[PDB]
Amino acid sequence: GAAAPSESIPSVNKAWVYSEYGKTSDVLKFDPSVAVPEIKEDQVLIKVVAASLNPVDFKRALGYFKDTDSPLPTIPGYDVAGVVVKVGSQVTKFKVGDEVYGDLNETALVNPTRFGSLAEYTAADERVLAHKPKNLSFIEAASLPLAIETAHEGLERAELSAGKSVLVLGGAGGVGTHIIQLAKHVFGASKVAATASTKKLDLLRTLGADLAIDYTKENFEDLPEKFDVVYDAVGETDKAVKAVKEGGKVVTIVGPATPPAILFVLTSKGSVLEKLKPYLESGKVKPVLDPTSPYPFTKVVEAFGYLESSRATGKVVVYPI
Ligand SMILES: NC(=O)C1=CN([C@@H]2O[C@H](COP(=O)(O)OP(=O)(O)OC[C@H]3O[C@@H](n4cnc5c(N)ncnc54)[C@H](OP(=O)(O)O)[C@@H]3O)[C@@H](O)[C@H]2O)C=CC1
Ligand SMILES: CC[C@H]1OC(C)=C(O)C1=O
């Protein structure tokens, strides 16, 4: 990985951009000529191959986090997979030509980049990236970082460990599909229970749930079974706290959190992906893609509209970019 010829990297590129807050159907526009970000010394420039959408992208675009956002206009997209084309002078872990993936924003709600992953090129901090597993496609890799890292961090915050039981509220989404798989296959849970609607129960079982609960037909909090860990990925902490054993832990990623549940927001770290690499290489933990994925780069507004419906099964990914 010697440097690319500097004139081989463009200074403008195609991207999706919004200039004011609002609904993606209203504000998200394609721009054929936006600046390619200049890298800082601890960043790399990536030729984007694929990107995933996350709810944070649309919530951010609605202005929910305006007080700590970066300045508009914004090119959205946190999740990226692609190929390194330039490395900053303090970078040690990556070279030109490395295939990488990660969630661009170390702190999702505080100064996320102006120059996201829904663009042909993006700048990424070395610290948020990992080497792409050779057995995963770029679509598959792009689908992973924000969700899998949120799953991982919530389970560590809940102190999940071998032999314990866990209940996942929202098992079929981008995050929940990884909560299940990590809980069973990485954290050694004895029993994994998860909620979803009627047609999604078989998927939950396939991913590692021992008990799949149809929330449209029964109320988990009214079951006699109580769990060592409850991980809420929906926003139902009032009920979650009724399903935990005394001394157990309840975490949520959708606030506000009713004590004793806690709310956290993930920290994006390439080291987490690196820790998970063997499970990803062996197939013990798999990417989960929505059947409508991938969406071409022309169809980003439609991809957002689908994610905004709250019905995605696993991940919504944009490819080719
Ligand atoms: N705090 C943080 O760090 C983070 C927070 N988040 C937040 O967490 C939430 C989940 O994100 P993500 O997984 O990407 O979202 P998705 O849009 O991928 O979740 C969609 C899934 O939610 C399921 N679902 C919806 N309502 C319910 C319910 N009441 N019970 C069970 N399942 C339900 C749907 O299954 P069905 O069709 O069966 O209802 C669908 O499969 C979002 O609000 C997001 O903003 C996400 C990541 C990090
Ligand atoms: C309430 C958490 C906020 O942060 C992330 C990453 C989301 O998806 C949110 O809504």
- CATH number (domain holding residue 1): 3.90.180.10
Of the listed ligands, the closest to the CA of 220 is: 1
Half-sphere exposure of residue 130: CA atoms within 13 angstroms, side-chain side: 26
Residue where a domain stops, chosen among 250, 266, 282:
266
Give the range of the structural domain holding residue 145, as residue numbers without chain letter.
1-151+267-321
Amino acid at 121: Y
315 known member of a binding site? no
Show the tokens assigned to 295.
């969406």
Q: For residue 122, give the 3-state DSSP assignment.
A: strand
Pocket lining: 150 vs ligand 1, CB cutoff 6 Å: yes
| CB 101, CB 124: distance < 8 Å | no
Q: Does residue 320 share a domain with residue 218?
A: no
| CB 196, CB 170: distance < 8 Å | yes
Kind plus residue range of the DSSP H or E element containing 61: helix 55-61
DSSP bridge partners of 85: none
Q: Does residue 229 share a domain with residue 110?
A: no
Q: Does residue 112 share a domain with residue 10?
A: yes
User: Strand 262-263 vs strand 191-196: parallel, antiparallel, or unpaired?
Assistant: unpaired
Residue where a domain stops, chosen among 220, 241, 266:
266
Pocket lining: 172 vs ligand 1, CB cutoff 6 Å: yes
Kind plus residue range of the DSSP H or E element containing 271: helix 270-282
Q: Does residue 256 share a domain with residue 163?
A: yes
Rounded CA-CA distance 144/116 in Å is 16
DSSP for 72-84, please give it.
Answer: SSBB---EEEEEE
Show the tokens assigned to 153.
């961090």
Of the listed ligands, the closest to the CA of 200 is: 1
DSSP bridge partners of 48: 82
Pocket lining: 195 vs ligand 1, CB cutoff 6 Å: yes
8 known member of a binding site? no
Q: Does residue 107 share a domain with residue 8?
A: yes
Q: Does residue 105 share a domain with residue 13?
A: yes
Q: Does residue 49 share a domain with residue 173?
A: no
Report the candidate in 299, 315, 262, 288 with the shortest Cα–Cα distance to residue 118: 299
Show the tokens assigned to 265.
């927001």
Q: For residue 280, give the 3-state DSSP assignment.
A: helix
Measured CA to CA in angstroms, residue 309 lies from 269, 305, 316 at distances of 29, 7, 12
Rounded CA-CA distance 188/141 in Å is 24
Backbone phi, psi, residue 181, to 5°: -65, -45
Span from the CA of 189 to the centroid of ligand 1 (angstroms): 22
| CB 82, CB 50: distance < 8 Å | yes
Pocket lining: 56 vs ligand 1, CB cutoff 6 Å: yes
Q: Does residue 137 share a domain with residue 49?
A: yes
- Count the Cβ atoms, other than its own, within 10 Å of residue 82: 27
27 known member of a binding site? no
Q: For residue 304, give the 3-state DSSP assignment.
A: helix
Rounded CA-CA distance 222/118 in Å is 43
- Nearest Cα residue to atom 2 of ligand 1: 265
Measured CA to CA in angstroms, residue 64 lies from 61, 67, 89 at distances of 7, 8, 35
- CATH classification at residue 216: 3.40.50.720
Report the candidate in 124, 17, 15 with the shortest Cα–Cα distance to residue 72: 17
Rounded CA-CA distance 141/270 in Å is 13
User: Strand 43-52 vs strand 121-125: parallel, antiparallel, or unpaired?
Assistant: antiparallel
Pocket lining: 109 vs ligand 2, CB cutoff 6 Å: yes
- Count the Cβ atoms, other than its own, within 10 Å of residue 41: 10
- Count the Cβ atoms, other than its own, within 10 Å of residue 55: 17
| CB 209, CB 171: distance < 8 Å | yes
Q: For residue 98, give the 3-state DSSP assignment.
A: coil
Span from the CA of 5 to the centroid of ligand 1 (angstroms): 43
| CB 46, CB 113: distance < 8 Å | no
Number of domains in the chain: 2
User: Strand 99-103 vs strand 165-169: parallel, antiparallel, or unpaired?
Assistant: unpaired
Helix pair angle (145-157, 176-185), 10° resolution: 50
Ligand 1 nearest atom to the CA of residue 176, by list position? 13
Residue whose token pair is 């809940």? 158
User: Strand 244-252 vs strand 227-232: parallel, antiparallel, or unpaired?
Assistant: parallel
Resolution of the structure, angstroms: 1.5
- Count the Cβ atoms, other than its own, within 10 Å of residue 47: 16
CA 189, 191, 193 angle in degrees (round to 5)? 115
Q: Does residue 303 share a domain with residue 165?
A: no
Residues 6+ apart with CB under 8 A from 64: none
- Nearest Cα residue to atom 3 of ligand 2: 56
